[PDB]
Design an enzyme around this catalytic site. Structure first.
Site, short mmCIF file in Angstrom:
data_model
loop_
_atom_site.label_atom_id
_atom_site.label_comp_id
_atom_site.label_asym_id
_atom_site.label_seq_id
_atom_site.Cartn_x
_atom_site.Cartn_y
_atom_site.Cartn_z
N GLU A 1 0.02 -0.17 -16.33
CA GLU A 1 0.49 -1.36 -15.62
C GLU A 1 1.33 -2.29 -16.49
OE1 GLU A 1 0.43 -2.06 -12.47
OE2 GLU A 1 -1.01 -0.63 -11.66
N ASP B 1 8.67 -7.22 -9.03
CA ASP B 1 9.14 -5.93 -8.58
C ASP B 1 8.96 -5.86 -7.06
OD1 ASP B 1 9.66 -5.19 -11.25
OD2 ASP B 1 7.67 -4.32 -11.51
N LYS C 1 -1.49 -8.83 -8.21
CA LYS C 1 -0.79 -9.72 -7.30
C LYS C 1 -1.76 -10.77 -6.77
CE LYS C 1 2.52 -6.15 -6.01
NZ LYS C 1 2.92 -5.14 -4.96
N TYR D 1 -4.59 -9.92 -4.19
CA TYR D 1 -5.59 -9.10 -4.87
C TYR D 1 -6.59 -9.99 -5.60
CZ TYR D 1 -7.17 -5.11 -7.87
OH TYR D 1 -7.87 -4.12 -8.52
N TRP D 2 -6.08 -10.98 -6.34
CA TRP D 2 -6.93 -11.90 -7.11
C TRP D 2 -7.80 -12.76 -6.19
CZ3 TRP D 2 -7.19 -17.31 -7.62
CH2 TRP D 2 -8.01 -17.76 -8.67
N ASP E 1 -8.81 -11.75 -3.20
CA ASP E 1 -9.78 -10.80 -2.66
C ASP E 1 -10.86 -10.39 -3.66
OD1 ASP E 1 -8.63 -10.86 -0.17
OD2 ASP E 1 -8.10 -8.74 -0.12
N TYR F 1 -12.74 -5.95 -7.05
CA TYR F 1 -11.89 -5.43 -5.98
C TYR F 1 -12.43 -4.09 -5.48
CZ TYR F 1 -7.59 -4.74 -3.27
OH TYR F 1 -6.67 -4.59 -2.26
N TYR G 1 -14.21 1.22 2.39
CA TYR G 1 -13.27 2.20 2.93
C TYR G 1 -13.61 3.64 2.54
CZ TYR G 1 -10.20 -1.44 4.79
OH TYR G 1 -9.68 -2.50 5.50
N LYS H 1 1.56 9.43 -6.61
CA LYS H 1 2.48 9.39 -7.76
C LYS H 1 1.90 8.56 -8.90
CE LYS H 1 6.15 11.91 -6.81
NZ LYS H 1 6.55 13.07 -7.64
C1 LIG Z 1 -3.12 -4.88 -8.31
C2 LIG Z 1 -2.50 -5.30 -7.02
O1 LIG Z 1 -2.09 -6.46 -6.88
N1 LIG Z 1 -2.43 -4.36 -6.06
C3 LIG Z 1 -1.56 -4.48 -4.90
C4 LIG Z 1 -2.36 -4.42 -3.60
O2 LIG Z 1 -3.28 -5.49 -3.55
C5 LIG Z 1 -1.43 -4.43 -2.37
O3 LIG Z 1 -2.14 -4.12 -1.20
C6 LIG Z 1 -2.45 -5.29 -0.42
O4 LIG Z 1 -3.63 -5.92 -0.89
C7 LIG Z 1 -3.99 -7.08 -0.16
C8 LIG Z 1 -5.10 -7.80 -0.93
O5 LIG Z 1 -6.26 -6.99 -0.94
C9 LIG Z 1 -4.38 -6.66 1.26
O6 LIG Z 1 -4.75 -7.78 2.04
C10 LIG Z 1 -6.14 -7.73 2.43
O7 LIG Z 1 -6.42 -6.77 3.42
C11 LIG Z 1 -7.79 -6.68 3.78
C12 LIG Z 1 -8.00 -5.51 4.74
O8 LIG Z 1 -7.03 -5.51 5.76
C13 LIG Z 1 -8.26 -8.02 4.38
O9 LIG Z 1 -9.64 -7.97 4.66
C14 LIG Z 1 -7.98 -9.17 3.42
O10 LIG Z 1 -8.19 -10.41 4.06
C15 LIG Z 1 -6.54 -9.13 2.90
N2 LIG Z 1 -6.41 -10.09 1.81
C16 LIG Z 1 -5.52 -11.09 1.84
C17 LIG Z 1 -5.66 -12.13 0.77
O11 LIG Z 1 -4.63 -11.17 2.68
C18 LIG Z 1 -3.15 -6.01 1.89
O12 LIG Z 1 -3.47 -5.56 3.19
C19 LIG Z 1 -2.63 -4.86 1.04
N3 LIG Z 1 -1.37 -4.38 1.58
C20 LIG Z 1 -1.22 -3.14 2.05
C21 LIG Z 1 0.18 -2.75 2.45
O13 LIG Z 1 -2.15 -2.34 2.19
C22 LIG Z 1 -0.34 -3.36 -2.56
C23 LIG Z 1 0.68 -3.34 -1.43
O14 LIG Z 1 1.46 -2.18 -1.59
O15 LIG Z 1 0.35 -3.56 -3.78
C24 LIG Z 1 -0.46 -3.42 -4.92
O16 LIG Z 1 0.35 -3.60 -6.05
#
Ligand SMILES: CC(=O)N[C@@H]1[C@@H](O)[C@H](O[C@@H]2O[C@H](CO)[C@@H](O[C@@H]3O[C@H](CO)[C@@H](O)[C@H](O)[C@H]3NC(C)=O)[C@H](O)[C@H]2NC(C)=O)[C@@H](CO)O[C@H]1O
Ligand SMILES: CC(=O)N[C@@H]1[C@@H](O)[C@H](O[C@@H]2O[C@H](CO)[C@@H](O[C@@H]3O[C@H](CO)[C@@H](O)[C@H](O)[C@H]3NC(C)=O)[C@H](O)[C@H]2NC(C)=O)[C@@H](CO)O[C@H]1O
Ligand SMILES: OC[C@H]1O[C@@H](O)[C@H](O)[C@@H](O)[C@@H]1O
Ligand SMILES: OC[C@H]1O[C@@H](O)[C@H](O)[C@@H](O)[C@@H]1O
Ligand SMILES: [Pt+2]
Ligand SMILES: [Pt+2]
Ligand SMILES: [Pt+2]
Ligand SMILES: [Pt+2]
Ligand SMILES: [Pt+2]
Ligand SMILES: [Pt+2]
Ligand SMILES: [Pt+2]
Ligand SMILES: [Pt+2]
Lengths: 123, 123
Positions: B18, B30, B42, B45-46, B48, B73, B81, B108
């Site tokens: 990373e 990015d 991101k 993520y933090w 959550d 996380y 899931y 990937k």
């Molecule tokens: C290390 C990093 O940042 N990873 C990135 C991923 O976090 C990101 O996926 C997205 O993550 C967010 C946060 O977990 C997801 O939102 C959550 O979704 C759940 C389930 O639907 C929901 O219960 C939560 O409330 C919600 N959290 C918030 C704060 O909104 C989001 O759905 C993810 N997006 C996708 C497309 O799945 C990915 C995106 O590609 O990038 C990583 O780098």
């Protein structure tokens, strides 16, 4: 690498990502099919890029043949499908196929490519 | 690193990938989002992962806090899931979000992680 529309810096980044430091690693199974060598080229891709070299697998494990294949794939498809002609466009084509540059899914590949040291915002 | 489901070896491999060798590099944009620190976390993520530490960016640049976030996380999402609870599952969750372990796009990332020295066959 072979000359063409894809920049040398872009190819180096792609090679480092696909084969873990740009190495002739041969074939690995991914999404139900084998991807081979420096650029992890699948068989249909090698057919489409003009069948350079002796055969798919030997070409894939040669830095010149495999990069020539990438160059020729972009010449064929990145142009026709009206992709942006830059590393992002080419990387997304490589990962996503003939119209990969217009698939949102391939953005994850572009994100990953930029994690490779020296590859942030590569053109 | 912080303890939890994700193995210390797995976390090291993720960290190296990373942040270009596991470094507190702060934030980079990015593909249209800011990702920060050792594990390129991101903001959603933090949020959550239970908002560990003082704030998102300071946590992300801290080896213990950022890894604690990763652990939490996975505790939240990899369980719910029904991901395989191993480095592959966790790496794909990290790359793809809450159900990343069941998305082909995250492969990937897993493929690249394994090619980092010391990371072949990591569990
Ligand atoms: C290390 C990093 O940042 N990873 C990135 C991923 O976090 C990101 O996926 C997205 O993550 C967010 C946060 O977990 C997801 O939102 C959550 O979704 C759940 C389930 O639907 C929901 O219960 C939560 O409330 C919600 N959290 C918030 C704060 O909104 C989001 O759905 C993810 N997006 C996708 C497309 O799945 C990915 C995106 O590609 O990038 C990583 O780098
Ligand atoms: C490096 C690498 O191997 N990348 C993979 C992609 O090649 C692959 O996308 C698929 O590529 C093939 C070969 O170009 C596509 O088939 C071609 O499609 C064009 C346009 O429709 C058609 O004119 C050609 O006849 C056809 N060639 C052959 C030999 O069949 C195919 O459509 C692409 N698939 C998709 C879903 O876009 C992707 C996806 O498998 O994976 C990369 O790893
Ligand atoms: O590693 C254990 C995990 O294995 C997966 O194949 C299952 O779907 C999960 O429910 C389980 O928690
Ligand atoms: O399922 C994940 C686990 O796999 C085991 O084989 C390892 O010893 C653990 O370190 C790891 O957390
Ligand atoms: Pt296979
Ligand atoms: Pt196979
Ligand atoms: Pt295909
Ligand atoms: Pt687009
Ligand atoms: Pt995305
Ligand atoms: Pt930004
Ligand atoms: Pt998001
Ligand atoms: Pt999102």
């Amino acid at each position: 690498f072979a000359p063409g529309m894809v920049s040398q810096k872009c190819l180096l980044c792609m090679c480092k990502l696909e084969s873990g430091g740009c190495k002739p690693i041969g074939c690995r199974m991914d999404v139900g099919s084998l991807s081979c060598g420096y650029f992890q080229i699948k068989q249909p891709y090698w057919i489409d890029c003009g069948k350079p070299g002796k055969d798919w697998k030997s070409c894939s494990n040669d830095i010149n043949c495999s990069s020539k294949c990438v160059q020729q794939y972009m010449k064929r498809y990145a142009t026709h499908y009206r992709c942006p002609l830059n590393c992002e466009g080419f990387a997304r084509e490589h990962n996503g196929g003939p119209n990969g540059c217009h698939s949102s899914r391939t953005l994850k590949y572009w994100e990953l490519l930029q994690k490779i040291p020296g590859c942030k915002g590569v053109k």
